[PDB]
Design a protein around this nucleic acid. Structure first.
Ligand SMILES: [Mg+2]
Ligand SMILES: [Mg+2]
Ligand SMILES: [Mg+2]
Ligand SMILES: [Mg+2]
Ligand SMILES: [Mg+2]
Ligand SMILES: [Mg+2]
Ligand SMILES: [Mg+2]
Ligand SMILES: [Mg+2]
Ligand SMILES: [Mg+2]
Ligand SMILES: [Mg+2]
Ligand SMILES: [Mg+2]
Ligand SMILES: [Mg+2]
Ligand SMILES: [Mg+2]
Ligand SMILES: [Mg+2]
Ligand SMILES: [Mg+2]
Ligand SMILES: [Mg+2]
Ligand SMILES: [Mg+2]
Ligand SMILES: [Mg+2]
Ligand SMILES: [Mg+2]
Ligand SMILES: [Mg+2]
Ligand SMILES: [Mg+2]
Ligand SMILES: [Mg+2]
Ligand SMILES: [Mg+2]
Ligand SMILES: [Mg+2]
Ligand SMILES: [Mg+2]
Ligand SMILES: [Mg+2]
Ligand SMILES: [Mg+2]
Ligand SMILES: [Mg+2]
Ligand SMILES: [Mg+2]
Ligand SMILES: [Mg+2]
Lengths: 258, 130, 131, 164, 141, 188
RNA sequence: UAUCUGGUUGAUCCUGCCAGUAGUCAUAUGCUUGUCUCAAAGAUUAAGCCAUGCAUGUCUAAGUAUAAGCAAUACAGUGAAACUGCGAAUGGCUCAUUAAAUCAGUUAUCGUUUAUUUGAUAGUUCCCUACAUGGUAUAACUGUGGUAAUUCUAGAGCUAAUACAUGCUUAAAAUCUCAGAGAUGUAUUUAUUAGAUAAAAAGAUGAUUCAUAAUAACUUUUCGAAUCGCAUGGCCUUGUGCUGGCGAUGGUUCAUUCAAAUUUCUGCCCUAUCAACUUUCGAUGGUAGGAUAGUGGCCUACCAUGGUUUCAACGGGUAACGGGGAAUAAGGGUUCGAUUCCGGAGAGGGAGCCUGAGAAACGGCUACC
RNA sequence: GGACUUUUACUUUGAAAAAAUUAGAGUGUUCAAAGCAGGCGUAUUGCUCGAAUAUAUUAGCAUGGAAUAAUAGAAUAGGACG
């Protein structure tokens, strides 16, 4: 009570980030930003816990102060800055870019993309209203309020962003067929098609999904991201390609490399 | 605070420091046997004033200080050493004697435990009362 | 406060304390393998019971239960990987058969005696112990 | 030692609850209205010290009166607080009249001066321009990107008007 | 409600809805209504009546969002609000058996509906509208 | 505190509850403004979130609206005549929402003349060409004309002076005026 | 990992308990104690009391430097004090209270506030300064001091701002308004209007009084940059003219994020030697207002007579904070959970309140005990 | 889209049930309790697999089933069908 929690206790931190139980007592509490605390992945995690470019926390606040680092082009010195789905990160050195993408097991994955074509970002539209003085705007999933949108784009769709300004370049409608990414649920992080909408007014819109190997599943609508035409992913995609496999299937692929 | 006591006296040889494998030797103990002896720690050492007790980290030989955390091992007096075989210290021949006695018990019977504890506590208060 | 360390008991004490049958059958296993405590025996029979516990619990699932096949292999994969399950007996529920002796055989202490090398299992133990 | 409240109108001593005015506010932060004792505005034999302010002089000087002559300790610092400390108008452009002050330690001794504020200078002028300029390039980009939108006013009213 | 509607000491009318006395469209009092959503639609008793009831799900300025529940009307004795009884069986795991339980629910009933005790009824969750009422009725079966 | 919690207050079963937790600030309420007539006076009140809110007490220069025409001329308020919550306000002439008041009404006569001109109840040319162009727009009700002969006009408040400071109302028309009329002379 | 044995008889078979047996992240305590790893720990009794010390302060290129501080041609480095800003509402501790309360899961805000982050977003202002407004003022400091005494403060003399208080600076069209001078933003508040969306003839949603726009006026007139730091490029008609770039701080609104406040369904241990309870003083509901951040008997006025209960209300008890969980487990069960996470409550007991986006705060203030 | 399948119980599946704990796959912490690590070769300017999975009872949500068990269907037809 009495105010906003500035702290995060380890084991209160999401399993996404995979931190050691024992280590220290606290987790890094994501700042306020574009995505959400639970769905974010702060800078300090990325630099030190997967890349292992940093060892201390003191290192990242010593490397971000270099302005070595940028997400969506902007520099972002805040050590505990909340970086989530679909953003990109160029780095001054290493001539090397990443986009933040889930693997099949639902955690954020390291994934590299070209110097160009990190120039663009994707985003799901969740709000379409009329602004003050009649100026229509959309809201993406990263807090971007983008004005003058192509009319009859409409909610649940996705939009390419040019990252020079908040420019909307193209848009994919949300319709039966389009390729999707799962962003929630037990099936978080899978890809493939779209085969139904149980409309369920007043309630949750469950949405039936079929993947490359023809596995049915359902996730509620706010757990799906429309990601372009089938077989033609509108974004560079990490080598796992989000398809799921049996727990017994995974064992065999290890014993292949005897 | 109620009933704890500073062990008070004088450093003659060596130094006392807060936390110490002091050997507390009562006036029964002899360096051969195990007797009125305790090997326990010296919580703190402070120098005495008139209700000031400014605390202190250690103290050399030839001075006047108090020790805390020692009292519970002391009946009335004693020598503290860190030698494996240092002897006791002379028994302070004084002049008066516990000769004028009286009888006590508690007005209320429930209080006797607080009385028997109290009589041990009073006997530490003074160097003479039996 | 930081997270709790987890810990577990490795052993389990018998129920009837003075059945000579168990008292003697235990002592035979001691001199044979050069053990000191019954804890050394108890630890192993507790392991073996913690193992049949899983084993009977998988045969109740009908063949082709993905969990049955998956940890059924995982078990035996770990049990002839040590030699306490013989290579032929890799079949499913030969596991329920093992006594403790197959484990004391695969102990380091016994091999250093059954590979020449020690002349006595009591000599083996101290040979291991002293670096 | 208790002080006198500017208007209380008592010969006695009493306790009031104090805000940021007169015998308070500090030492404690952010209000915080400690209740302290004060003494009345009217005088009586129980005082130790009375604070009097000389207003008129009369016949004979006093040695704490005439000879004792201590100075102002700081000179003006706003441009117009300097400018109209002498009567110089907007047309005098100080930095020539700001007072200096000397000090001697190691014998270059060169003076310290107070850095006028409210100073009419670039880039106070430049930033003033750069500010009003930004108002328009944004407004002009706003105005024109606004209309760039309404050319799909045509095409999407040419699939419902040019659709037969 | 009765006495036309102006039994209350305040004048009773829908807010911001205008009976303008300079255009004689002969309805002579405009009737604002809304389709409630979720399937069930406004009864003609609501469109055509002339009650006020700021709490009516159709006439009133109140909306229906949460659970929709079915109970059976057990009391019909306070003005514009009733209470229903929802019955169910609670499960006692140890005995692997059930016991009959039941809660009561005070529910606003817009004067669009005549409702008698008996009468299975369909209610939907609206904003807190009294100390005990958080549900409004939509059907009669 | 003047607390707004349900946690005093017997539950629906009739049962006195216990006091867990002291009053929290986020469930507070404040005293009413009880805003009177005249000598316009308003007090800022610092409400939650830093947001201000203006406490009318002694207001007199109250905006209004007609608004069959949409006129909204600031006009004096002279008294209150009827209140549906208790009639202890009509005799303290304290103004709240849903009170019924007498307003100056001359700024409305002197706008009726301006637009149309008759008036009740006994200079350029861009207005003459629109003067009798607007016709059939001087049909009052017997209800509303009969008042300028007395001067003061009957209106009801729609704003919340305690909250908004500015107190603004509309004017009674239709059965709204008919209903409130059958109680002003029902009291009489 | 599905086991029983001793004890009633002269003997028997029973019932049936006492005793035995095994575990306990279960406390205590006795004897004994070499190595390594791990690591609970003033919960229970007394949410009893506390000596001393510490536990919250904070500075960048970038709010204010004339330290009579260091180091050597308005200022310029470094920089105590003070102002300003921000924080102190997290953390940590404890489990006293609390039994439909808390809590868990599951809903709801078409019922609200929201610092901050992030993203979008703003040409208009006079009823005689804009090359830049006032002291509408003062700290530190100088100096005169009181008191046994506190992080007590007075009296006199200076001077800053992103402190406080102000306020002028504009095009280009149109719409009005007197062959053409001025008024036209935003927010506060009201009322009316559109928000179509079922064929032939004179935008969103399951749903809205939604978003948004329009008219007519209102206001003690809200915000609409007199702020900093780094750079100095371009212009010729070569003038403190005119221009201009990368950053910092700030602001109205909307979105967002961290939040929060309410909130729908279902679920608590023992007790009838608790069977009726609630409503004069709000009990259940109705209209109206008041109040709130906002719904609501939250409160007030008026009215009505309602609301709960044997499917256990109400009352009593708890050596009761809820929960994830712990112990024992053939299966079913039994016993626990103050305590590493989550939620909640409290800071000797009560109440109150200032500040602030956030507290009914306690290492804040006020009062009583 | 305009009128409802009388309406419930039960049961199948799915999403849901934080992390830790438990169960449990992997991994010579020298074993083990653990931990979520780690694994393959060059006198060095690298390569690479993991951080599973499950039971997470209720109540609610989505759903397939239509036995079992209730319940309404016209009898003063005021009834179905147009
Ligand atoms: Mg301060
Ligand atoms: Mg049994
Ligand atoms: Mg016998
Ligand atoms: Mg027993
Ligand atoms: Mg026992
Ligand atoms: Mg012991
Ligand atoms: Mg050693
Ligand atoms: Mg202690
Ligand atoms: Mg205690
Ligand atoms: Mg806290
Ligand atoms: Mg911003
Ligand atoms: Mg001055
Ligand atoms: Mg001054
Ligand atoms: Mg109990
Ligand atoms: Mg109300
Ligand atoms: Mg308790
Ligand atoms: Mg409990
Ligand atoms: Mg127990
Ligand atoms: Mg607990
Ligand atoms: Mg306790
Ligand atoms: Mg502890
Ligand atoms: Mg806690
Ligand atoms: Mg508190
Ligand atoms: Mg205490
Ligand atoms: Mg307090
Ligand atoms: Mg505190
Ligand atoms: Mg404290
Ligand atoms: Mg869990
Ligand atoms: Mg385990
Ligand atoms: Mg292991």
């Amino acid at each position: 009570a009495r105010g906003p929690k500035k702290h995060l206790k380890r084991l209160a931190a999401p399993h996404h980030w995979l931190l050691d139980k024992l280590s220290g007592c606290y987790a890094p509490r994501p700042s306020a930003g574009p995505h959400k605390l639970r769905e974010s992945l702060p800078l300090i995690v990325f630099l030190r816990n997967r890349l292992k470019y940093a060892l201390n926390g003191r290192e990242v606040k010593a490397i971000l102060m270099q302005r070595h680092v940028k997400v969506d082009g902007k520099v972002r010195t805040d050590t505990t800055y909340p970086a989530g789905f679909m953003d990109v990160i160029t780095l001054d050195a290493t001539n090397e870019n990443f986009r933040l993408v889930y693997d099949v097991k639902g955690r954020f994955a390291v994934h590299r993309i070209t110097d160009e074509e990190a120039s663009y970002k994707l985003g799901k539209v969740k709000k379409v209203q009329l602004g003050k003085k009649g100026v229509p705007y959309v809201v993406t999933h990263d807090g971007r309020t983008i004005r003058y949108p192509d009319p009859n784009i409409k909610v649940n769709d996705t939009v390419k962003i040019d990252l020079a300004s908040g420019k909307i370049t193209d848009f994919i409608k949300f319709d039966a067929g389009k390729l999707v990414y799962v962003t929630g649920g037990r099936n978080l992080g899978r890809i493939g098609t779209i085969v139904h909408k149980e409309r369920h007014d007043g309630g949750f819109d469950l949405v039936h999904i079929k993947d490359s190997l023809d596995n049915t599943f359902v996730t509620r609508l706010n757990n799906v991201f429309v990601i372009g035409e089938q077989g033609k992913p509108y974004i560079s995609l990490p080598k796992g390609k989000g398809i799921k496999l049996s727990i017994a299937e995974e064992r065999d692929r290890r014993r292949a490399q005897q | 605070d109620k009933g704890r006591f500073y062990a008070f006296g004088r450093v003659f040889a060596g130094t006392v420091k807060s936390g110490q494998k002091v050997r507390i030797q009562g006036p029964n103990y002899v360096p051969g046997k195990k007797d009125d002896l305790f090997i326990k720690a010296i919580q703190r050492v402070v120098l005495m004033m008139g209700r000031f007790v400014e605390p202190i980290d250690d103290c050399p030989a030839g001075n006047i200080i108090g020790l805390v955390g020692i009292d519970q091992f002391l009946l009335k007096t004693g020598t503290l050493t860190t030698s494996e075989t240092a002897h006791n210290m002379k028994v302070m021949k004084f002049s008066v004697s516990p000769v004028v006695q009286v009888a006590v018990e508690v007005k209320n019977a429930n209080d006797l435990p607080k009385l028997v504890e109290g009589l041990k506590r009073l006997s530490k208060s003074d160097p003479c009362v039996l | 406060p930081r997270a709790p360390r987890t810990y577990s008991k490795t052993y389990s004490t018998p129920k009837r304390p003075y059945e000579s049958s168990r008292l003697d059958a235990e002592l035979k296993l001691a001199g044979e393998f050069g053990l000191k405590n019954k804890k050394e025996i108890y630890r192993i029979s507790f392991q073996l019971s913690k193992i049949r516990r899983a084993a009977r619990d998988l045969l109740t699932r009908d063949e082709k239960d993905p969990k049955r096949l998956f940890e059924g292999n995982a078990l035996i994969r770990r049990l002839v990987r040590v030699g306490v399950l013989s290579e032929d007996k890799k079949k499913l529920d030969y596991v329920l058969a093992l006594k403790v002796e197959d484990f004391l055989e695969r102990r380091l202490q016994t091999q250093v005696y059954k590979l020449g090398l020690a002349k006595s299992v009591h000599h083996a133990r101290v040979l291991i112990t002293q670096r | 030692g208790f002080p006198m409240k500017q208007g209380v109108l008592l010969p006695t001593r009493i306790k009031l609850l104090l805000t940021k005015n007169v015998s308070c506010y500090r030492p404690r932060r952010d209000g915080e209205r400690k209740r302290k004792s004060v003494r009345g505005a009217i005088v009586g034999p129980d005082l130790a010290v009375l604070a009097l302010v000389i207003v008129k002089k009369g016949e004979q000087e006093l040695e704490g009166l005439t000879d004792t002559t201590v100075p102002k300790r700081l000179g003006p610092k706003r441009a117009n607080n300097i400018r109209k400390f002498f009567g110089l108008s907007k047309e005098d452009d100080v930095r020539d009249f700001v007072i200096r002050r000397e000090v001697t330690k190691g014998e270059k001794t060169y003076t310290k001066a107070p850095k006028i504020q409210r100073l009419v200078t670039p880039q106070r002028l430049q930033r003033k321009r750069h500010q009003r300029a930004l108002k328009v390039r944004n407004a002009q980009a706003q105005r024109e990107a606004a209309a760039e939108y309404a050319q799909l006013l045509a095409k999407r009213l040419s699939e419902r008007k040019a659709e037969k | 409600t009765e006495l036309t509607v102006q039994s209350e000491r305040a004048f009773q009318k829908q807010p911001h809805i205008f009976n303008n006395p300079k255009v004689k469209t002969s309805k002579r009092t405009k009737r604002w209504y809304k389709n409630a959503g979720l399937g069930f639609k406004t009864p003609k008793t609501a469109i055509e009546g002339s009650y006020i009831d700021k709490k009516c799900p159709f006439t009133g300025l109140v909306s229906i969002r949460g659970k929709i529940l079915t109970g059976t009307v057990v009391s019909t004795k306070m003005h514009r609000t009733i209470v229903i009884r929802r019955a169910y069986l609670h499960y006692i795991p140890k005995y692997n058996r059930y016991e009959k339980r039941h809660k009561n629910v005070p529910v606003h009933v817009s004067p669009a509906f005549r409702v008698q005790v008996g009468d299975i009824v369909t209610v939907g969750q609206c904003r807190p509208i009294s100390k005990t009422v958080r549900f409004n009725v939509v059907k009669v079966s | 505190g003047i607390s707004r919690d349900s946690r005093h207050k017997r539950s629906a079963t009739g049962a006195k509850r216990a006091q867990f937790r002291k009053k929290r600030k986020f469930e507070l309420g404040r005293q009413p403004a009880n805003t009177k007539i005249g000598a316009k006076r308003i007090h800022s009140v610092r409400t939650r979130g830093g947001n201000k809110k203006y406490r009318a007490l002694r207001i007199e220069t109250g905006n209004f609206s007609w608004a069959s025409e949409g006129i909204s001329k600031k006009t004096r308020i002279a008294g209150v005549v009827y209140h549906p919550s208790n009639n202890e306000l009509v005799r303290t002439n304290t103004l709240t929402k849903a009170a019924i008041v007498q307003i100056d009404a001359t700024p409305f006569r002197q706008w009726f003349e301006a637009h149309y001109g008759q008036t009740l109840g006994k200079k350029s040319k861009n207005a003459e060409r629109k003067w009798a162009a607007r016709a059939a727009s001087a049909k009052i009700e017997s209800s509303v004309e009969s008042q300028f002969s007395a001067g003061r006009l009957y209106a009801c408040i729609s704003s919340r002076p305690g909250q908004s400071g500015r107190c603004d109302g509309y004017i009674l028309e239709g059965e709204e005026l008919a209903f409130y009329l059958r109680r002003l002379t029902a009291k009489k």
